[PDB]
């Protein structure tokens, strides 16, 4: 019943929320050291001794493992490394939730290439850690969907609205015990990382529903879809794409509509430098665009 | 004698140094960080160049200053951006130094020639600008790019200063919106050329419709790099001595063009120029300080100086330079 | 019946949202430069331009504001004066919503002010101004009560709704035409001094109830309610009060309870420096304090 | 807390000092070459003197800082033949030294109350004297004589670039015209003897008659010492942390006065001393900027603070008592 | 002789320079920021106090070391606070100036006696504890707060390479906990503050229940002060030039006592103190590096020297002190 | 980007300039005092050659490390014996102006890749090695050899300290063994030439009798440039920002090899050496630290690196080449 849980961000906050809806203790919260209600207040609510270590690869900490004795172990959306000098410490196993669709589709940055494309279908899946890293085999896996009208918040809240109908499903799995596995494809395994920031330039030259993906990918609060003129910064909020001249010029200004390799793009909303979000056409007429 | 050129890459350093050559009592040594644009001199014997940067640099300015016998600051810092982001920086940078070497000037008795700006008359509503006799007006305190600005007038006072109780041999020259061939570049945060006549090359080159300010009626003064330089050469000799405590503006009042008959200009050539097809057509026009006359008598008072060179001459040179000298290669 | 509104932060938004469900047209935004709802975003959706002036103290924003020519001014928890050079431009006048019994102490920072006192009985006041800022006549008063477990989020978002059911009819009454206000009582106007950083430090000789409702209102995301011993730091999130004793002693340790003015104190959620949050075994551990 | 205040020995800083003596928790340091002025509150316990010269000392003034938590520059030069004379240790002293300290104040994250003067806004039209929005007019070009003054003014600049990149918590306070007990003499380098309250003495101790300069109907405007003084004292506690980078001025607008109003009041006070026999009659009258307005929205935005004691008192208290204290050495 | 002691505010300080003032051919010239702890010691003639602080000062302190014949550092941050909040200063500070007080002594040829810090063993495990031969212990890297610890035995080797090149007299001496009249308080900078002792003397005070600590088992010994500085008189007299190049350590082995019986013995003092009226009563016991071994090998090899006095009068004497000089000032 | 190498004539400067001469975006202006091991690549055209020496030039290096976008020391004193000969010059080059170059960084918020020593473990006792969290150990101080290596380790622990109060981007990277062409004298003082190998030189081309040291156990670990340089390259770009505030180790742990066996296959690699009868044969056997692991979880976390190079194909191609260029001459 009781187990040691290694959680972080929201991810963990709502794993948390979902086993406490079916009355799971947990005896420790190994979290790293750090708007919304903080999961330390409720373990405090509940009166349950709390830990966050730098690291757990010392002897102290296997022996907290070793007699504290936990009988499932969990991973929500971590970003310390938990390598397998600390699986081999687990009973039962791990279980570590990703979202992306194992095991076809592997590469770099799954995240965002599965916005550029706007699939209808994509994934999350909990899985078995093994001592090769992310290879163990599926346990579970569920589908969702994509808008096209879905913005960062709002499909994020989606993936929170998944995490809990899906959890909802795999705990009587495990409360009632060990669950068949499904085999993966030995031959399509990687190792995933990140991005770097020099992606959100804007190259004029990609074709209109790329540049929507990438005008979706940068959405309030991410650091944005930025590209300069001359000495002047600016970054794009939301745009649509739209059905001459030559490729490259401005075709009007209110609303303003840029060329692109295919078709044109009308932007909605813009930030100049430190300046504060406007619509298209003053923008242009402080940058000094022309029709 | 010993001539040592602050800041000679660049534009104005460029053909000052060219002018210099032409005379044979002269030796050259041109200190900067950097030596791409007179590189075309590099090889000719009396030209020595040193690498060195005010802002770092002591010992090897103040050893040349003790070596040399003229002494010609040149460069500044134009950087739009770096106004707003750190001003401390060309506070730090464009005012102590220079201020150093006006002392050190001081101590070794030797000639200043310090560029000032023409930019001080600003907005004065008189139909005819003057220096020292007409009011001047100024914008307001909030816009920051001034901080630095102003600071440069001030500056200049300091010199005047050095006037009254112990003399020290000082000319303050003012050139006006200047033109002449080898272009600055794009980027290059360097003064030398007229704001309207780059963004005119700009409308040209990426064939942008002209945006005609209240139809182009504001009128600007040119003039070319040969004669005023020239003028220079003969103060640098400073004939008659009686150039000292005077201030010299360089300007051609009369060659007055308001935007619309630059544009006029600009069309008739370009529609006659024979290159144009590896180039993007014009757009049409699009409708959308005003005027400057300074006064050009202390020239004649002190030198008996006249201009020669006009205007739409020199924009045919500059333009057909411009754009036949663009590599085939990009 | 175009107007220029003066707004910010949550309740500014709100104000625009009840305004746009009567109908009013907003020529511009006069905003201040600024985890809120930006208002760039809606007025983007909606297509309402937005200025957002370092000061309007000028000739020519006035200029700008006689050409929109605004029939009404709204005030939403403003700080700095309203001199008169904002009082002409008005035909109806300024009217201000503000979170106090006027006329009692009036001015910045009023939200203290207020819960000093801890009544059960507090709301939402609309006035209007006249040339000494906060004396015309009250338009209307609302009263909301508040509970002895109220944390201060709940508290301001029961004003939010509060302040979009009050708007809902006091819109209405400004449609149909002017109405004979309530005059304000000048009888019962008082001027104070300035706040200490004291009240930031727990001192022990005040009684449980007062400092209790402070904590109680100063949670999170406030800084919280922080004191020092020694050179050690903490901060009391919450706590609850239990029933002739000395000062200064420690009482009990599982459960741990200080000893204050009157009744005795209780930690349940508290964190020391910049560490987690957890009840107060832990600290007296680090501490070392025992009954 | 700690307050370093540089000048200590005079008018203001006296002031200052005796007004924060009756507050418990102000140690007092206090630099200057001299200590005549503050020769009673020296055996104040917690009041100490330092002989010190921001000219030379510079490792012990920076100790001074480090050591103290609030500094207070208060030096300035006020004497205008030194304009003449020497501008060039006025302009290196009272610019470059301060400059070096407000830097070090910077480097180690100090707090700054920075003495800024009135006369930065010269003859804007506006009915309301405006600091970053209103225009200027500026005097003669071929005069440099009063070119340090102006140069106090671009010192404020500095301290505006301060703000947007570092947000140092610099406070830009100016007096307009304070008078109380205490003053200073003719040679004396402290700021406040207004030209016309000294010209109002000298013209009665020499017993000249009264110059009416235009018909003495130029107005002028006066402030009281405390109010000033109790001002800065809720700048220093900062009352509500509303203060910081922000543009506080302390003036009384509503006295507005002509020479002559002032004549016949000092007058209507003074007849009435009894001592007045070891000082000459009056001479009878010969015949012989203009008009500025403050803004005190700040004031109430940040402080609340209006002035209480009614003028004609304070300065008949104050001339007779300097008319009994008259120096028996001479 | 002549004596300098830097950091004369102290508290081994006060007790040194009492026990200087025994000896009648010794000017003492005290330099620190504070004189309070040696209040008494101003009016004494051949005792000179000097404000200053090693951190400004440099010349000056060398115009010291040049007047005087021997030069005592005893300078360093027993404070946990300056760990905790930013030990970069500290460690920068309080480290790299003592390099340069040691270049400036060899330089000028000057008898040097440093007090190395007792922190250098931290948790040797190993059976032969050893000074020179066996190993340190430190913990976990990711702390910042021990740098500086181990930085001063750096130091100490340091000083050791001065002999090997130019020959400079050194002595490295280290005082182990020493405790008697006139304590100090929690946040004073001053060496020779043993934390469990005050705590001890804390939990006395506040009349908490005694804590007993996992039984209060863990064992202490302690030193007397004037015998350890009668040992430092025979090597200011250097009897035999037997003490260059050795370190010198002074404890006392014997006094081996755990908490426990300290703590009885504690109370057998405590409760005879008349002024416990004024003191809350005995609250009773409450259940909840462990070993210095000194070697005084090299003591008997330089000195001869062996300690006499007894602790537990002492320490019942240091407690009965501190009781009845309890700060009045409420 | 530009890149500055501090001592860039080296093993490792070589092996990095002419790997970074294969990327299109780097301008490489090394400075040091020679540059005779960089002959060949001197000529290329962003290659450029600076003569210098940081114990003596203060605003060049500054001017350096301004002008450029990365800033590397390569520098370190790999000669046992200088540790003895005049340790006070080692004390003085390698501690206080690395401490310089660290802090001028700092002011210039450069991104700083620093080369700390593989003698930080040392001689831990613990058999599981870490970086962080195990002890560490210090020698005898009668034993100069650690006088060097301990304080090295301190300034690694400074530049960690600047990040969480400068927030400074360090990278401190440890060198492990490495191996490849072009193999350092015997009196060069650059990194880079394994003890184990460079005696086996001696061993082979001096011709002496192979030393059966106690059998030959010892195990060592060995890596190839090309690895570690691709690292390098991963880190100056920064991929996935994971490398800021992280302490990286390169090596090759699997791959280790005892001294029986390295002398084995050396010899095997020798029986098959062309150039043999222009060397004289071996001269027959004379008969005569024990682990180290590295943990490099963190390198595989930041940047998923993986080895490729395997020993003995390095060995024998570097033997031959070093081997083949015996000097023909003689």
Known sequence: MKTVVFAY?????????????????????????????????????????????????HPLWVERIAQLSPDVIFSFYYRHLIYDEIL???????????GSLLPKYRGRAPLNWVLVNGETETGVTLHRMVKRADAGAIVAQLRIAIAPDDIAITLHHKLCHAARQLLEQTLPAIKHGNILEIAQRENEATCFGRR???????????????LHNMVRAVADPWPGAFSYVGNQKFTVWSS??????????????????????????????????DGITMQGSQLAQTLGLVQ | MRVLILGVNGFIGNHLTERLLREDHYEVYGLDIGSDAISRFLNHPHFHFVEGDISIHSEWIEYHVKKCDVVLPLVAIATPIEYTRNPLRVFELDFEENLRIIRYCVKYRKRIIFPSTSEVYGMCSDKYFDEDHSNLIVGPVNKPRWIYSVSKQLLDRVIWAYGEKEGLQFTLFRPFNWMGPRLDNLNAARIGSSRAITQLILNLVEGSPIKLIDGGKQKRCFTDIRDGIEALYRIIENAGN??????????????????????????????????????????????????????????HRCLDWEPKIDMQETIDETLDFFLRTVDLTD
């Not at chain 1, 799971?24 to 708007?35: G, K, L, Q």
């Not at chain 1, 081999?88 to 990703?98: E, K, Y």
């Not at chain 2, 006659?272 to 026009?285: D, E, I, N, Q, V």
């Open chain 1, 9 to 57: 961000h929201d991810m963990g906050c709502l794993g948390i929320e979902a086993l406490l809806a079916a009355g799971y203790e947990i005896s420790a919260i190994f979290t790293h050291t750090d708007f919304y209600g903080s999961v330390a207040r409720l373990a405090a609510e509940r009166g349950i001794p709390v830990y966050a270590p730098d690291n757990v690869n």
């Open chain 1, 88 to 98: 081999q410490l687990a009973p039962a196993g791990a279980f570590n939730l990703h």
């Open chain 1, 196 to 210: 770097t920031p020099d992606d959100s330039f804007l190259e004029w030259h990609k074709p209109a529903s790329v």
């Open chain 1, 240 to 273: 649509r794409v739209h059905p001459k001249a030559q490729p490259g010029s401005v075709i009007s200004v209110a609303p303003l509509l840029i060329a692109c390799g295919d078709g044109a793009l009308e932007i909605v909303t813009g930030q100049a430098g």
């Open chain 2, 242 to 299: 009686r150039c000292d405590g005077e201030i010299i503006n360089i300007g051609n009042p009369e060659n007055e063009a308001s935007i619309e008959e630059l544009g006029e200009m600009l069309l008739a050539s370009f529609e006659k120029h024979p290159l144009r097809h590896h180039f993007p057509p014009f757009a049409g026009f699009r409708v959308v300080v005003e005027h400057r006359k300074p006064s050009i008598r202390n020239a």
